[PDB]
Amino acid sequence: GSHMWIGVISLFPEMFKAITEFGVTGRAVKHNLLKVECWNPRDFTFDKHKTVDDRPYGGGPGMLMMVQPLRDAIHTAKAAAGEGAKVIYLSPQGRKLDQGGVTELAQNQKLILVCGRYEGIDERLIQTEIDEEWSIGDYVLTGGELPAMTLIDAVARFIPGVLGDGLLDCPHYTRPEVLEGLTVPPVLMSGHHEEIRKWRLKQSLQRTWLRRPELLEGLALTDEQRKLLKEAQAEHNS
């Protein structure tokens, strides 16, 4: 129904087997809920050695992706996608991805993801070919493929059929009842669904406050959430 098509431009398309052949995303691909289609700039070269990098104007230690093979690969992906495809470039200079941004990106039925390698791509290609630039985090990687796969994995979770409040998750427990002397909180064994719900919510509120208090600032807590957070803060202060 709400299946998603993702075109990828990458010098290493075989990396994408990590998401198309395994786990939840692998299942999504097999079931046609997600399609990932790759184009490799190396296939758009014409010289004997299939050159895909080029020297930066102004000098410097690094190389950039060569414009012509990359541009031709992007154009081919765009032609395959048809109308309505948003072209995304992954880099540390982009908009910071968070779950809200994931949900925004997931509204697209078609995306094209451009994966950089080496020390950059020509700025004029960003101006002329790229719709949006996004970053998965404030760290530097060797290429855009892992960020692209990260984005695909995150948006895939919103496609209906793929899976079976601003707070961190609560602790979870499974067998055995006692592990290294540590027991399961009795509330989780009580079978009281309402008590269990409130315990889990209180724990999420407490953990968010202690570990990521800035996340709480962005929330308008419900009356119930205000109460449970206040209880948690009181207990923390003994």
Ligand X SMILES: Nc1nonc1C(=O)NCc1ccc(Cl)cc1
Of residues 108-147, which lie at the interface with ligand X (CB under 6 A)? Answer: 116-118, 120-121, 135-137, 139-141, 143-144, 147
CB of 235 to ligand X, least distance (A): 27
Q: Is 57 annotated as a binding residue?
A: no
Task: Give me the helix-helix angle, 223-236 and 193-211, nearest 10°.
Answer: 70
Beta bridge partners, 38, equal: 8
The one-character DSSP state at 237 is T
Residue 18 binds which one of ligand X, its own copies, none, with CB within 5 to 8 A depending on kind? Answer: its own copies
CB of 238 to ligand X, least distance (A): 32
**Tokens 């109460």 label which residue?**
227
Diameter over CA atoms, the chain: 73
**Tokens 């490799």 label which residue?**
40
Radius of gyration of the chain (CA): 23
Residue 223 binds which one of its own copies, ligand X, none, with CB within 5 to 8 A depending on kind? Answer: none
**In this structure, what token pair is assigned to residue 76?**
């081919």
Site residues for its own copies, 136-195, by CB under 8 A, read: 136-143, 145-147, 149-150, 153-154, 156-157, 164, 168-169, 171-176, 179-180, 182, 184, 187-189, 193
Residue 39 binds which one of its own copies, ligand X, none, with CB within 5 to 8 A depending on kind? Answer: none
Among 3, 5, 35, 54, binds its own copies (CB under 8 A): 54
Question: Which run of H or of E encompasses 179?
Answer: strand 178-179
Site string for its own copies, 192-221 (x = CB under 8 A): -x--x--xx------x---x---x------
Q: Is 141 annotated as a binding residue?
A: yes
For 37-66, b/e burial (b = at least 16 CB within 10 A) is: ebbbbbebbeeeeeebbbeeeeeeeeebbb
Is 119 a binding residue for its own copies by CB under 8 A? The answer is yes
Rounded Cα distance, 191 and 206, in Å: 23
Residue 116 binds which one of ligand X, its own copies, none, with CB within 5 to 8 A depending on kind? Answer: ligand X
Which candidate, 133, 8, 10, 119, places its Cα nearest to that of 62?
119
Is 181 exposed, middle or buried, given 0-12, 13-18 or 19+ CB atoms closer than 10 A?
exposed
Which residue, 127 or 238, has its beta carbon nearer to its own copies?
Answer: 127
3-state secondary structure of 163: coil
Q: Is 29 annotated as a binding residue?
A: no
Which residue, 81 or 136, has its beta carbon nearer to its own copies?
Answer: 136
Is 101 a binding residue for ligand X by CB under 6 A? The answer is no
Site residues for its own copies, 95-114, by CB under 8 A, read: 96-99, 101-102
Residues that bind ligand X (CB under 6 A): 65, 90-92, 116-118, 120-121, 135-137, 139-141, 143-144, 147
